[PDB]
Amino acid sequence: DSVRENLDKMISEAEVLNDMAARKLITLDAEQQLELMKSLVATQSQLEATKNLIGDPNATVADLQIAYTTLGNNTQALGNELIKLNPN
């Protein structure tokens, strides 16, 4: 069972959705652009925090665990937002 650092996995997943979202961004009208932006910025914010945290070789098994869970939840939500715009 993988170390608390299958964040590396969540981290690289978050990056990719964030990239995808920044592209769906220009192609959207205001109302929808803002919906996406709200979840994108949140994911971007959390990702950056998670990156800082894992830089601290100390931290804790909990703070890391929260980071993973939160970053995951944000990433998950961005996914649904992306699907909600272009089911494709």
GROMACS .gro file of N, CA and C in nm:
model
  264
    1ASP      N    1   0.085  -0.118   0.000
    1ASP     CA    2   0.000   0.000   0.000
    1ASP      C    3   0.087   0.121   0.000
    2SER      N    4   0.057   0.219  -0.085
    2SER     CA    5   0.150   0.327  -0.112
    2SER      C    6   0.159   0.434  -0.007
    3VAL      N    7   0.281   0.484   0.008
    3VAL     CA    8   0.312   0.583   0.108
    3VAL      C    9   0.208   0.690   0.098
    4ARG      N   10   0.197   0.768   0.205
    4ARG     CA   11   0.118   0.889   0.201
    4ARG      C   12   0.151   0.974   0.078
    5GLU      N   13   0.259   0.941   0.007
    5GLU     CA   14   0.293   1.016  -0.109
    5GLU      C   15   0.268   0.946  -0.244
    6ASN      N   16   0.141   0.908  -0.255
    6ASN     CA   17   0.066   0.908  -0.379
    6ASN      C   18  -0.013   1.040  -0.382
    7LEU      N   19   0.055   1.147  -0.341
    7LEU     CA   20   0.010   1.282  -0.365
    7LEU      C   21   0.072   1.315  -0.498
    8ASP      N   22   0.199   1.276  -0.513
    8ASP     CA   23   0.269   1.285  -0.640
    8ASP      C   24   0.176   1.247  -0.754
    9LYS      N   25   0.091   1.147  -0.730
    9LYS     CA   26  -0.010   1.106  -0.826
    9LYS      C   27  -0.127   1.204  -0.837
   10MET      N   28  -0.171   1.257  -0.723
   10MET     CA   29  -0.282   1.351  -0.721
   10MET      C   30  -0.233   1.484  -0.774
   11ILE      N   31  -0.112   1.521  -0.733
   11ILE     CA   32  -0.047   1.641  -0.783
   11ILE      C   33  -0.038   1.645  -0.935
   12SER      N   34   0.006   1.537  -0.998
   12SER     CA   35   0.019   1.542  -1.142
   12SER      C   36  -0.118   1.532  -1.210
   13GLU      N   37  -0.215   1.474  -1.142
   13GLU     CA   38  -0.350   1.472  -1.195
   13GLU      C   39  -0.415   1.611  -1.190
   14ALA      N   40  -0.390   1.682  -1.081
   14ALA     CA   41  -0.447   1.814  -1.062
   14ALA      C   42  -0.394   1.909  -1.166
   15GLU      N   43  -0.263   1.901  -1.191
   15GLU     CA   44  -0.195   1.982  -1.293
   15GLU      C   45  -0.261   1.967  -1.429
   16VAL      N   46  -0.288   1.842  -1.466
   16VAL     CA   47  -0.344   1.815  -1.598
   16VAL      C   48  -0.486   1.870  -1.613
   17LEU      N   49  -0.570   1.850  -1.512
   17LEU     CA   50  -0.704   1.907  -1.519
   17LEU      C   51  -0.699   2.057  -1.523
   18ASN      N   52  -0.609   2.115  -1.445
   18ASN     CA   53  -0.591   2.259  -1.442
   18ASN      C   54  -0.552   2.316  -1.579
   19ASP      N   55  -0.459   2.248  -1.646
   19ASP     CA   56  -0.423   2.279  -1.784
   19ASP      C   57  -0.545   2.270  -1.875
   20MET      N   58  -0.615   2.157  -1.871
   20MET     CA   59  -0.735   2.141  -1.951
   20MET      C   60  -0.835   2.251  -1.927
   21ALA      N   61  -0.847   2.296  -1.803
   21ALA     CA   62  -0.952   2.388  -1.771
   21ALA      C   63  -0.916   2.525  -1.826
   22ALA      N   64  -0.787   2.560  -1.817
   22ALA     CA   65  -0.742   2.689  -1.865
   22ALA      C   66  -0.770   2.702  -2.015
   23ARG      N   67  -0.769   2.590  -2.087
   23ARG     CA   68  -0.805   2.589  -2.229
   23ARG      C   69  -0.963   2.601  -2.243
   24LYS      N   70  -1.044   2.523  -2.174
   24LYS     CA   71  -1.187   2.537  -2.193
   24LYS      C   72  -1.233   2.674  -2.158
   25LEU      N   73  -1.146   2.752  -2.102
   25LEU     CA   74  -1.177   2.880  -2.045
   25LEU      C   75  -1.212   2.985  -2.148
   26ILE      N   76  -1.123   3.006  -2.244
   26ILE     CA   77  -1.146   3.105  -2.349
   26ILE      C   78  -1.273   3.080  -2.433
   27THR      N   79  -1.310   2.953  -2.448
   27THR     CA   80  -1.420   2.914  -2.535
   27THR      C   81  -1.558   2.923  -2.469
   28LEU      N   82  -1.567   2.995  -2.358
   28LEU     CA   83  -1.688   2.995  -2.278
   28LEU      C   84  -1.743   3.134  -2.260
   29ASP      N   85  -1.874   3.143  -2.247
   29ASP     CA   86  -1.936   3.271  -2.219
   29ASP      C   87  -1.916   3.306  -2.073
   30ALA      N   88  -1.931   3.434  -2.040
   30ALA     CA   89  -1.914   3.485  -1.904
   30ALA      C   90  -1.972   3.394  -1.796
   31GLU      N   91  -2.103   3.370  -1.800
   31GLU     CA   92  -2.171   3.294  -1.694
   31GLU      C   93  -2.099   3.163  -1.663
   32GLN      N   94  -2.060   3.092  -1.769
   32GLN     CA   95  -1.994   2.963  -1.754
   32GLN      C   96  -1.845   2.977  -1.724
   33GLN      N   97  -1.784   3.081  -1.778
   33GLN     CA   98  -1.642   3.107  -1.756
   33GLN      C   99  -1.613   3.123  -1.607
   34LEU      N  100  -1.700   3.194  -1.537
   34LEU     CA  101  -1.682   3.219  -1.395
   34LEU      C  102  -1.701   3.094  -1.313
   35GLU      N  103  -1.795   3.008  -1.350
   35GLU     CA  104  -1.816   2.882  -1.279
   35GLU      C  105  -1.691   2.795  -1.280
   36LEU      N  106  -1.630   2.790  -1.397
   36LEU     CA  107  -1.512   2.710  -1.414
   36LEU      C  108  -1.399   2.775  -1.335
   37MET      N  109  -1.389   2.906  -1.345
   37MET     CA  110  -1.279   2.976  -1.283
   37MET      C  111  -1.280   2.950  -1.132
   38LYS      N  112  -1.399   2.948  -1.072
   38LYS     CA  113  -1.410   2.931  -0.928
   38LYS      C  114  -1.350   2.797  -0.887
   39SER      N  115  -1.380   2.692  -0.962
   39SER     CA  116  -1.322   2.564  -0.923
   39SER      C  117  -1.178   2.550  -0.966
   40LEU      N  118  -1.143   2.610  -1.079
   40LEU     CA  119  -1.004   2.606  -1.122
   40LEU      C  120  -0.916   2.677  -1.021
   41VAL      N  121  -0.950   2.800  -0.983
   41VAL     CA  122  -0.860   2.873  -0.893
   41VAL      C  123  -0.841   2.796  -0.762
   42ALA      N  124  -0.949   2.735  -0.713
   42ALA     CA  125  -0.944   2.660  -0.587
   42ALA      C  126  -0.846   2.546  -0.600
   43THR      N  127  -0.857   2.473  -0.711
   43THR     CA  128  -0.768   2.362  -0.733
   43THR      C  129  -0.625   2.413  -0.745
   44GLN      N  130  -0.606   2.524  -0.813
   44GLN     CA  131  -0.472   2.577  -0.832
   44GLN      C  132  -0.411   2.619  -0.699
   45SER      N  133  -0.496   2.670  -0.611
   45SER     CA  134  -0.453   2.723  -0.484
   45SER      C  135  -0.407   2.611  -0.393
   46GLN      N  136  -0.489   2.506  -0.389
   46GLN     CA  137  -0.468   2.391  -0.305
   46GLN      C  138  -0.346   2.313  -0.353
   47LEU      N  139  -0.334   2.298  -0.484
   47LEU     CA  140  -0.219   2.233  -0.544
   47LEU      C  141  -0.090   2.299  -0.502
   48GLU      N  142  -0.090   2.431  -0.495
   48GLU     CA  143   0.032   2.504  -0.464
   48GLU      C  144   0.067   2.485  -0.320
   49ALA      N  145  -0.037   2.473  -0.237
   49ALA     CA  146  -0.019   2.452  -0.093
   49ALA      C  147   0.035   2.312  -0.069
   50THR      N  148  -0.020   2.216  -0.142
   50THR     CA  149   0.019   2.079  -0.128
   50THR      C  150   0.164   2.064  -0.172
   51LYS      N  151   0.203   2.141  -0.272
   51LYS     CA  152   0.340   2.136  -0.320
   51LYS      C  153   0.437   2.188  -0.214
   52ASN      N  154   0.398   2.294  -0.145
   52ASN     CA  155   0.478   2.351  -0.039
   52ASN      C  156   0.489   2.253   0.075
   53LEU      N  157   0.379   2.184   0.104
   53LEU     CA  158   0.372   2.104   0.224
   53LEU      C  159   0.465   1.988   0.211
   54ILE      N  160   0.455   1.915   0.101
   54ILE     CA  161   0.544   1.803   0.079
   54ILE      C  162   0.690   1.842   0.068
   55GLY      N  163   0.717   1.971   0.052
   55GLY     CA  164   0.854   2.022   0.054
   55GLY      C  165   0.913   2.017   0.194
   56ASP      N  166   0.827   2.041   0.293
   56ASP     CA  167   0.860   2.022   0.434
   56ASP      C  168   0.876   1.872   0.463
   57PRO      N  169   1.000   1.827   0.476
   57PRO     CA  170   1.028   1.686   0.503
   57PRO      C  171   0.977   1.642   0.639
   58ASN      N  172   0.918   1.735   0.714
   58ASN     CA  173   0.865   1.704   0.847
   58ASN      C  174   0.713   1.690   0.845
   59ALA      N  175   0.644   1.803   0.850
   59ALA     CA  176   0.498   1.803   0.849
   59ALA      C  177   0.438   1.698   0.941
   60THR      N  178   0.349   1.616   0.886
   60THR     CA  179   0.284   1.510   0.964
   60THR      C  180   0.200   1.420   0.874
   61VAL      N  181   0.167   1.302   0.925
   61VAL     CA  182   0.087   1.206   0.849
   61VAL      C  183  -0.057   1.255   0.833
   62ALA      N  184  -0.096   1.349   0.918
   62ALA     CA  185  -0.230   1.405   0.913
   62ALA      C  186  -0.237   1.520   0.815
   63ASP      N  187  -0.151   1.620   0.834
   63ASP     CA  188  -0.149   1.735   0.745
   63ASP      C  189  -0.133   1.693   0.599
   64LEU      N  190  -0.049   1.591   0.577
   64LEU     CA  191  -0.032   1.531   0.447
   64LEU      C  192  -0.159   1.463   0.404
   65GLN      N  193  -0.224   1.397   0.497
   65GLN     CA  194  -0.344   1.323   0.463
   65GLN      C  195  -0.458   1.419   0.426
   66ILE      N  196  -0.461   1.534   0.493
   66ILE     CA  197  -0.564   1.634   0.466
   66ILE      C  198  -0.536   1.695   0.329
   67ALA      N  199  -0.410   1.730   0.307
   67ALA     CA  200  -0.366   1.782   0.179
   67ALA      C  201  -0.414   1.691   0.066
   68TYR      N  202  -0.386   1.561   0.078
   68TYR     CA  203  -0.430   1.466  -0.022
   68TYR      C  204  -0.581   1.470  -0.038
   69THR      N  205  -0.654   1.464   0.072
   69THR     CA  206  -0.800   1.452   0.063
   69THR      C  207  -0.860   1.578   0.002
   70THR      N  208  -0.808   1.694   0.043
   70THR     CA  209  -0.860   1.821  -0.004
   70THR      C  210  -0.825   1.841  -0.151
   71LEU      N  211  -0.697   1.824  -0.184
   71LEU     CA  212  -0.653   1.836  -0.322
   71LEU      C  213  -0.734   1.742  -0.411
   72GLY      N  214  -0.762   1.622  -0.361
   72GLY     CA  215  -0.839   1.524  -0.435
   72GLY      C  216  -0.979   1.574  -0.461
   73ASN      N  217  -1.044   1.625  -0.356
   73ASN     CA  218  -1.181   1.674  -0.364
   73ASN      C  219  -1.195   1.788  -0.461
   74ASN      N  220  -1.100   1.881  -0.456
   74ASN     CA  221  -1.096   1.991  -0.550
   74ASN      C  222  -1.080   1.945  -0.693
   75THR      N  223  -0.984   1.855  -0.716
   75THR     CA  224  -0.960   1.794  -0.847
   75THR      C  225  -1.086   1.721  -0.893
   76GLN      N  226  -1.149   1.646  -0.804
   76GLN     CA  227  -1.269   1.575  -0.842
   76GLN      C  228  -1.374   1.673  -0.894
   77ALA      N  229  -1.396   1.779  -0.818
   77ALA     CA  230  -1.496   1.880  -0.854
   77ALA      C  231  -1.474   1.952  -0.988
   78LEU      N  232  -1.348   1.985  -1.014
   78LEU     CA  233  -1.306   2.044  -1.139
   78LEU      C  234  -1.340   1.950  -1.253
   79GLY      N  235  -1.320   1.820  -1.231
   79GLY     CA  236  -1.358   1.717  -1.327
   79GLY      C  237  -1.505   1.727  -1.364
   80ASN      N  238  -1.591   1.728  -1.263
   80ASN     CA  239  -1.734   1.732  -1.289
   80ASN      C  240  -1.774   1.859  -1.360
   81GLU      N  241  -1.707   1.969  -1.325
   81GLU     CA  242  -1.733   2.097  -1.389
   81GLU      C  243  -1.699   2.086  -1.538
   82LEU      N  244  -1.584   2.026  -1.567
   82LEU     CA  245  -1.541   2.005  -1.705
   82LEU      C  246  -1.638   1.919  -1.785
   83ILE      N  247  -1.685   1.810  -1.725
   83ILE     CA  248  -1.785   1.724  -1.786
   83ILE      C  249  -1.917   1.798  -1.802
   84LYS      N  250  -1.957   1.874  -1.701
   84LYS     CA  251  -2.081   1.950  -1.706
   84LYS      C  252  -2.089   2.049  -1.824
   85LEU      N  253  -1.973   2.088  -1.877
   85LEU     CA  254  -1.967   2.181  -1.989
   85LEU      C  255  -1.960   2.108  -2.122
   86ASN      N  256  -1.878   2.004  -2.128
   86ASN     CA  257  -1.861   1.925  -2.249
   86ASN      C  258  -1.859   1.775  -2.221
   87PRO      N  259  -1.977   1.718  -2.199
   87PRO     CA  260  -1.989   1.574  -2.171
   87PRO      C  261  -1.900   1.491  -2.262
   88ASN      N  262  -1.899   1.523  -2.391
   88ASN     CA  263  -1.818   1.450  -2.487
   88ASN      C  264  -1.753   1.326  -2.426
   0.00000   0.00000   0.00000
